[PDB]
Short mmCIF file of C-alpha atoms and ligand atoms in Angstrom, two decimals:
data_model
loop_
_atom_site.label_atom_id
_atom_site.label_comp_id
_atom_site.label_asym_id
_atom_site.label_seq_id
_atom_site.Cartn_x
_atom_site.Cartn_y
_atom_site.Cartn_z
CA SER J 1 228.49 50.35 155.64
CA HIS J 2 225.85 48.70 154.35
CA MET J 3 223.30 47.19 151.48
CA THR J 4 220.00 48.95 149.42
CA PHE J 5 218.73 46.20 149.46
CA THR J 6 218.19 42.29 150.46
CA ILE J 7 216.54 40.06 148.78
CA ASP J 8 213.44 40.49 151.73
CA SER J 9 213.68 44.16 151.35
CA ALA J 10 213.28 43.69 147.53
CA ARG J 11 210.20 41.96 147.54
CA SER J 12 207.63 44.59 149.07
CA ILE J 13 208.17 46.52 145.16
CA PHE J 14 205.31 48.15 143.33
CA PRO J 15 202.98 47.29 147.08
CA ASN J 16 199.45 47.63 145.09
CA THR J 17 199.86 44.81 143.41
CA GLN J 18 197.24 42.42 144.06
CA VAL J 19 198.07 38.60 143.80
CA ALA J 20 195.83 36.13 144.57
CA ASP J 21 195.81 34.96 147.60
CA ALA J 22 192.66 32.54 147.50
CA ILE J 23 194.52 30.54 144.97
CA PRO J 24 197.24 29.72 148.99
CA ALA J 25 194.35 29.91 151.35
CA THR J 26 192.74 26.98 149.48
CA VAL J 27 195.07 25.54 148.97
CA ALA J 28 195.71 25.50 152.71
CA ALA J 29 192.13 24.88 153.60
CA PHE J 30 192.50 22.15 151.10
CA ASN J 31 195.97 20.62 153.65
CA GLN J 32 193.47 19.98 156.61
CA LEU J 33 191.09 17.39 154.96
CA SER J 34 191.47 13.94 154.54
CA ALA J 35 193.57 12.07 152.34
CA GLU J 36 191.03 10.54 151.14
CA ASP J 37 189.01 14.28 150.61
CA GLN J 38 192.30 14.81 149.10
CA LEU J 39 191.99 12.90 146.22
CA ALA J 40 188.07 12.83 145.26
CA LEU J 41 188.39 16.18 145.62
CA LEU J 42 191.45 16.77 142.55
CA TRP J 43 189.17 14.00 141.17
CA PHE J 44 186.50 16.97 140.44
CA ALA J 45 188.67 19.68 140.24
CA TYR J 46 190.59 18.27 137.52
CA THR J 47 187.62 16.24 135.36
CA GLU J 48 186.22 19.62 136.17
CA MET J 49 188.49 21.88 134.09
CA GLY J 50 187.30 19.36 130.50
CA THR J 51 188.67 20.47 127.80
CA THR J 52 190.28 24.03 129.23
CA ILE J 53 194.00 20.97 130.29
CA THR J 54 195.56 20.39 126.68
CA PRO J 55 197.52 16.41 128.73
CA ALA J 56 199.06 15.24 125.99
CA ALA J 57 201.54 17.26 124.42
CA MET J 58 203.78 17.36 127.69
CA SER J 59 202.71 14.16 129.06
CA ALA J 60 204.06 12.22 126.25
CA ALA J 61 207.75 14.46 126.29
CA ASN J 62 207.82 13.86 129.80
CA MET J 63 206.76 9.84 130.73
CA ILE J 64 210.11 8.34 130.18
CA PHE J 65 210.82 9.08 133.74
CA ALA J 66 207.40 8.60 135.29
CA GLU J 67 207.68 5.40 133.18
CA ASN J 68 208.19 2.52 136.16
CA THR J 69 206.54 3.93 138.78
CA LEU J 70 203.85 3.95 136.95
CA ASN J 71 203.69 0.33 136.30
CA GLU J 72 204.63 -0.84 139.25
CA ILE J 73 201.55 1.07 140.25
CA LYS J 74 199.79 -0.61 137.91
CA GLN J 75 200.12 -4.02 138.77
CA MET J 76 199.42 -3.44 142.18
CA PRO J 77 196.28 -4.59 143.24
CA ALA J 78 193.62 -2.08 143.82
CA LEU J 79 194.30 -1.70 148.03
CA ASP J 80 198.03 -0.49 147.30
CA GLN J 81 197.10 1.81 144.14
CA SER J 82 194.35 3.23 146.79
CA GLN J 83 197.33 3.50 149.84
CA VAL J 84 200.13 4.59 147.79
CA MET J 85 197.73 7.83 145.91
CA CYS J 86 197.03 7.95 150.06
CA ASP J 87 200.65 8.23 150.27
CA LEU J 88 201.07 10.76 148.26
CA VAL J 89 198.77 13.13 149.77
CA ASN J 90 199.26 12.56 153.07
CA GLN J 91 202.92 13.90 152.49
CA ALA J 92 204.36 10.48 153.59
CA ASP J 93 208.20 9.52 154.01
CA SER J 94 207.43 6.60 151.32
CA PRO J 95 210.36 5.69 148.82
CA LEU J 96 208.13 6.21 146.36
CA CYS J 97 206.98 9.90 148.38
CA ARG J 98 210.51 10.49 147.55
CA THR J 99 210.80 9.63 143.77
CA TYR J 100 208.16 11.42 143.60
CA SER J 101 210.08 14.38 144.95
CA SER J 102 211.94 13.98 142.82
CA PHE J 103 210.87 14.49 139.66
CA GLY J 104 210.11 17.54 137.72
CA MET J 105 206.95 19.21 137.84
CA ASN J 106 206.38 18.59 134.33
CA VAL J 107 206.24 14.69 134.40
CA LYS J 108 205.24 14.65 138.35
CA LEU J 109 201.39 16.26 136.36
CA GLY J 110 202.33 13.81 133.57
CA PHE J 111 202.04 10.83 136.05
CA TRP J 112 199.22 12.17 137.96
CA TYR J 113 197.23 12.26 133.47
CA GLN J 114 197.82 8.87 132.96
CA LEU J 115 196.25 7.82 136.85
CA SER J 116 193.54 9.62 136.01
CA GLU J 117 193.07 7.56 132.75
CA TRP J 118 194.09 4.35 134.13
CA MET J 119 191.34 6.09 137.21
CA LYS J 120 188.62 5.99 134.47
CA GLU J 121 189.22 2.80 132.75
CA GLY J 122 189.69 1.04 136.33
CA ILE J 123 193.18 -0.16 135.70
CA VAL J 124 193.91 2.15 139.22
CA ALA J 125 191.50 1.68 142.48
CA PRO J 126 189.43 4.88 141.05
CA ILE J 127 188.16 6.94 143.34
CA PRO J 128 184.53 5.03 144.41
CA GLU J 129 180.60 5.36 142.43
CA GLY J 130 179.49 8.04 144.00
CA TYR J 131 181.85 9.45 146.26
CA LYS J 132 180.33 12.55 148.34
CA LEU J 133 183.46 15.03 150.30
CA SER J 134 182.77 16.01 153.51
CA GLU J 135 181.21 19.36 154.43
CA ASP J 136 185.06 20.70 154.36
CA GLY J 137 186.31 18.79 151.79
CA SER J 138 182.53 20.59 150.39
CA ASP J 139 183.54 23.78 150.26
CA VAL J 140 187.71 23.72 148.95
CA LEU J 141 185.86 22.95 146.00
CA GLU J 142 183.15 25.26 145.69
CA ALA J 143 186.49 27.61 146.32
CA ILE J 144 187.78 26.52 143.74
CA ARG J 145 185.65 26.14 141.45
CA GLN J 146 184.75 30.62 142.23
CA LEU J 147 188.32 30.78 140.57
CA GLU J 148 189.76 31.97 137.07
CA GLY J 149 189.99 28.87 134.91
CA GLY J 150 193.98 29.73 135.33
CA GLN J 151 194.04 30.76 139.31
CA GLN J 152 192.05 27.52 140.14
CA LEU J 153 194.83 25.09 137.08
CA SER J 154 197.44 26.99 139.48
CA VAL J 155 195.32 25.67 143.10
CA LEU J 156 196.07 21.94 140.88
CA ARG J 157 199.52 22.96 140.16
CA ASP J 158 201.04 23.78 143.74
CA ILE J 159 199.44 20.43 145.08
CA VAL J 160 200.87 18.47 142.19
CA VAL J 161 204.02 19.57 142.60
CA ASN J 162 203.86 19.94 146.93
CA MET J 163 202.35 16.04 147.21
CA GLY J 164 205.56 13.43 148.51
CA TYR J 165 208.16 13.98 150.40
CA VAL J 166 209.25 17.55 151.56
CA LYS J 167 217.56 18.09 144.03
CA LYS J 168 215.10 17.83 140.50
CA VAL J 169 216.56 15.79 138.52
CA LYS J 170 214.24 13.27 137.02
CA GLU J 171 213.34 15.90 133.80
CA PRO J 172 214.16 15.63 129.96
CA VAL J 173 216.66 18.02 129.11
CA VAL J 174 215.80 21.53 127.21
CA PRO J 175 215.82 22.07 123.94
CA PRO J 176 216.15 26.00 123.58
CA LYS J 177 214.03 27.29 120.43
CA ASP J 178 215.91 27.73 116.18
CA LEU J 179 216.77 31.22 116.26
CA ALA J 180 214.45 31.47 112.58
CA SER J 181 211.85 30.75 114.61
CA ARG J 182 212.04 33.32 118.34
CA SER J 183 209.72 36.82 119.10
CA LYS J 184 210.18 39.97 119.70
CA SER J 185 208.22 41.28 122.86
CA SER J 186 206.83 44.40 122.82
CA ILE J 187 206.17 46.21 126.69
CA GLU J 188 203.97 49.18 126.29
CA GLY J 189 205.42 52.32 127.97
CA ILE J 190 208.50 50.00 128.75
CA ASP J 191 211.75 49.64 127.06
CA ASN J 192 214.29 48.33 129.74
CA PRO J 193 216.78 46.36 127.74
CA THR J 194 216.77 42.68 130.42
CA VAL J 195 213.28 43.14 130.72
CA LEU J 196 212.99 42.18 126.66
CA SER J 197 215.74 39.92 126.90
CA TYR J 198 215.10 38.18 130.02
CA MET J 199 210.55 37.66 128.45
CA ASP J 200 212.89 37.09 124.44
CA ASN J 201 214.82 34.46 126.04
CA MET J 202 211.85 32.95 128.00
CA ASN J 203 209.62 33.21 125.03
CA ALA J 204 212.68 30.75 122.57
CA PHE J 205 213.43 28.16 126.08
CA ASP J 206 216.81 30.10 125.87
CA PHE J 207 217.31 29.11 129.81
CA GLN J 208 221.25 30.07 129.22
CA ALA J 209 221.07 33.42 127.86
CA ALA J 210 217.87 34.44 130.71
CA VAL J 211 220.34 33.69 133.38
CA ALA J 212 222.70 35.42 132.03
CA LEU J 213 220.57 38.71 132.77
CA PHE J 214 221.16 38.25 136.54
CA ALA J 215 222.71 38.86 139.38
CA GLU J 216 225.72 36.68 141.47
CA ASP J 217 223.35 36.65 144.48
CA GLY J 218 219.89 37.45 142.09
CA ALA J 219 217.17 35.64 142.55
CA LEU J 220 213.57 34.15 141.18
CA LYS J 221 210.82 34.50 142.87
CA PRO J 222 208.15 31.91 141.59
CA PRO J 223 203.92 32.51 142.19
CA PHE J 224 203.11 31.97 146.52
CA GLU J 225 207.44 30.24 146.57
CA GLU J 226 210.22 31.27 148.08
CA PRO J 227 212.56 33.03 145.97
CA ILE J 228 215.42 30.68 144.17
CA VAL J 229 219.08 32.71 144.79
CA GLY J 230 221.31 32.17 142.04
CA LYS J 231 222.46 31.70 138.48
CA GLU J 232 223.05 27.61 139.81
CA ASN J 233 219.40 27.60 141.21
CA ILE J 234 217.44 30.07 138.44
CA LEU J 235 218.92 27.18 135.97
CA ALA J 236 217.85 24.09 137.16
CA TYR J 237 214.90 25.76 138.24
CA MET J 238 214.21 27.42 134.68
CA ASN J 239 215.32 23.21 133.01
CA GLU J 240 212.28 22.34 134.96
CA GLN J 241 208.99 24.58 134.88
CA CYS J 242 209.78 26.97 131.95
CA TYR J 243 209.93 24.78 129.07
CA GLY J 244 206.49 25.83 126.33
CA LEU J 245 205.78 28.47 128.14
CA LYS J 246 203.83 31.73 126.03
CA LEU J 247 204.64 34.97 127.91
CA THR J 248 203.13 37.79 126.37
CA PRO J 249 204.40 41.32 128.43
CA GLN J 250 201.51 43.67 127.69
CA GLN J 251 202.60 46.64 129.41
CA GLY J 252 204.38 48.18 132.22
CA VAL J 253 206.44 50.72 134.70
CA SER J 254 209.82 51.91 134.99
CA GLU J 255 211.11 53.82 138.08
CA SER J 256 214.82 54.81 140.16
CA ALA J 257 215.01 52.82 143.10
CA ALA J 258 216.85 54.00 146.07
CA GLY J 259 220.93 53.33 144.85
CA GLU J 260 220.76 53.22 141.27
CA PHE J 261 219.34 50.08 141.44
CA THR J 262 215.76 50.66 138.82
CA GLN J 263 212.56 49.38 139.47
CA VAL J 264 210.35 47.62 136.59
CA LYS J 265 206.01 45.93 136.37
CA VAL J 266 205.44 44.21 133.97
CA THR J 267 202.20 42.63 133.58
CA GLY J 268 200.85 40.20 130.46
CA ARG J 269 199.31 36.88 130.00
CA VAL J 270 201.15 33.76 130.65
CA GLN J 271 200.09 30.25 128.38
CA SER J 272 201.16 26.67 130.20
CA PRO J 273 202.24 24.40 127.54
CA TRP J 274 199.35 22.15 129.74
CA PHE J 275 196.66 24.89 128.81
CA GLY J 276 193.79 25.29 126.66
CA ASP J 277 193.29 27.98 124.20
CA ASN J 278 192.24 31.46 125.44
CA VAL J 279 193.19 29.54 128.96
CA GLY J 280 195.86 32.62 129.88
CA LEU J 281 196.55 33.56 134.17
CA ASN J 282 196.75 37.19 134.25
CA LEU J 283 200.21 37.70 135.76
CA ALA J 284 202.82 39.84 136.73
CA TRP J 285 206.52 40.39 137.25
CA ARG J 286 208.16 43.08 139.66
CA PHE J 287 211.75 43.27 138.54
CA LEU J 288 214.62 44.97 140.92
CA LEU J 289 217.61 45.73 138.54
CA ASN J 290 221.31 46.44 139.60
CA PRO J 291 222.62 50.22 138.83
CA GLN J 292 224.65 47.32 136.18
CA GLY J 293 221.05 46.22 134.54
CA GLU J 294 221.46 42.43 136.10
CA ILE J 295 218.14 41.45 137.94
CA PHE J 296 218.30 41.29 141.38
CA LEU J 297 215.13 40.15 141.53
CA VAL J 298 212.21 39.14 139.69
CA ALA J 299 209.22 38.29 141.21
CA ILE J 300 206.45 36.48 138.88
CA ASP J 301 202.49 36.58 140.25
CA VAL J 302 199.61 35.10 139.59
CA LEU J 303 197.19 38.59 139.28
CA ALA J 304 194.10 38.57 141.26
CA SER J 305 191.43 40.34 138.61
CA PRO J 306 192.24 41.02 135.25
CA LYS J 307 191.69 45.06 136.99
CA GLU J 308 195.28 43.95 138.23
CA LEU J 309 197.03 44.35 134.46
CA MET J 310 195.86 48.44 134.19
CA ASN J 311 197.35 49.00 137.79
CA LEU J 312 201.33 50.49 137.05
CA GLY J 313 202.21 54.30 137.77
CA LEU J 314 202.33 55.69 141.21
C1 ECH N 1 196.59 14.25 141.14
C2 ECH N 1 195.28 13.98 141.80
C3 ECH N 1 194.65 13.88 140.24
C4 ECH N 1 194.83 14.12 138.97
C5 ECH N 1 195.39 15.07 138.88
C6 ECH N 1 195.44 16.43 137.75
C7 ECH N 1 196.69 15.46 136.40
C8 ECH N 1 196.39 17.35 137.73
C9 ECH N 1 196.41 18.50 136.46
C10 ECH N 1 196.90 19.67 136.47
C11 ECH N 1 197.46 20.62 134.99
C12 ECH N 1 198.26 19.72 134.40
C13 ECH N 1 197.71 21.61 136.01
C14 ECH N 1 199.09 22.71 134.83
C15 ECH N 1 198.87 24.41 134.92
C16 ECH N 1 200.22 25.44 135.14
C17 ECH N 1 200.29 25.92 134.88
C18 ECH N 1 199.18 26.47 136.67
C19 ECH N 1 201.52 26.82 135.06
C20 ECH N 1 201.74 28.34 135.30
C21 ECH N 1 202.50 28.74 134.99
C22 ECH N 1 203.13 30.36 135.25
C23 ECH N 1 202.32 31.65 136.40
C24 ECH N 1 204.68 29.97 135.04
C25 ECH N 1 205.37 31.31 135.20
C26 ECH N 1 206.68 32.34 135.56
C27 ECH N 1 206.84 32.85 134.18
C28 ECH N 1 205.97 33.36 133.05
C29 ECH N 1 208.13 33.68 134.40
O1 ECH N 1 208.39 34.61 134.26
C30 ECH N 1 209.12 32.28 135.44
C31 ECH N 1 209.13 31.29 135.26
C32 ECH N 1 207.07 31.32 135.60
C33 ECH N 1 207.10 31.60 137.40
C34 ECH N 1 207.42 29.89 135.37
C35 ECH N 1 193.58 12.65 140.12
C36 ECH N 1 192.67 13.34 139.52
C37 ECH N 1 194.21 10.96 139.00
C38 ECH N 1 192.51 12.16 141.51
C39 ECH N 1 193.82 12.20 142.77
C40 ECH N 1 194.88 12.70 142.77
#
């Protein structure tokens, strides 16, 4: 009397999948730096991207939620403005740091975008002119710079959402696309209707229909994060982060797994609404589907290199 799979065990499907281990490795080294090296580093890392980041639409959609905090920061004198940003990057326990944690990912990113423009403008205390990183800061920055552009964005995203204090409810409601404006996924080697439905629903921003594909104890595991377990939790996450994505699943493989479960690996690209033209992250989706065809786990990973797109069969 036992269990074929746990979420823990499920997470080992498809072991020859190389993830971009350098992303969290670099975030971990970033976390050892001083607050002033940290903010300067993000300044340099952010600013480097230039055109790669398309900040305009997402900022606009999300700014209602950050407006009051931002304007409160706007009215502070420079030394208070610096101190608040130091509090966020240090993960201090302040009411502002807690309000920051309650913001949705896209609100957090629009917040920092606004601070980036005001810093440029000198409405917010900028990074001191000619500020120069420590040897350790400099090294984290070169590590970032060695990554593919999408992976650098992953670093930035990871750092941003983990600032402030450690239920994300302050985000906009998601409009699903019109029924007349949706796209049907085609994946080479794969006809699995759960997988195609996951792709199509996610692409249409129909997160009720995507959550409906999961088991009651099913789980969605983002890149470098713990699994999110159960429909209410998965829907909440999808509302926070999955608006505006263009998923391009390209290939995959299906195999039977123990106890009439089915294991499905897909590789492809995502484009975030924050990304430019031709920026995509290469992803794996690794599904474990129970015998009833429902998602017990889907695990999304950023791939180490484009070589991993065709790492499929066994
Ligand atoms: C901080 C800071 C500053 C400003 C920083 C700014 C302004 C940063 C902007 C960064 C941005 C805009 C990054 C955006 C990145 C987006 C990424 C990398 C998203 C990837 C998405 C993926 C991989 C999604 C895939 C998924 C799929 C396909 C699924 O099947 C299910 C869900 C999910 C897993 C989500 C300044 C300069 C002031 C200095 C002081 C501190």
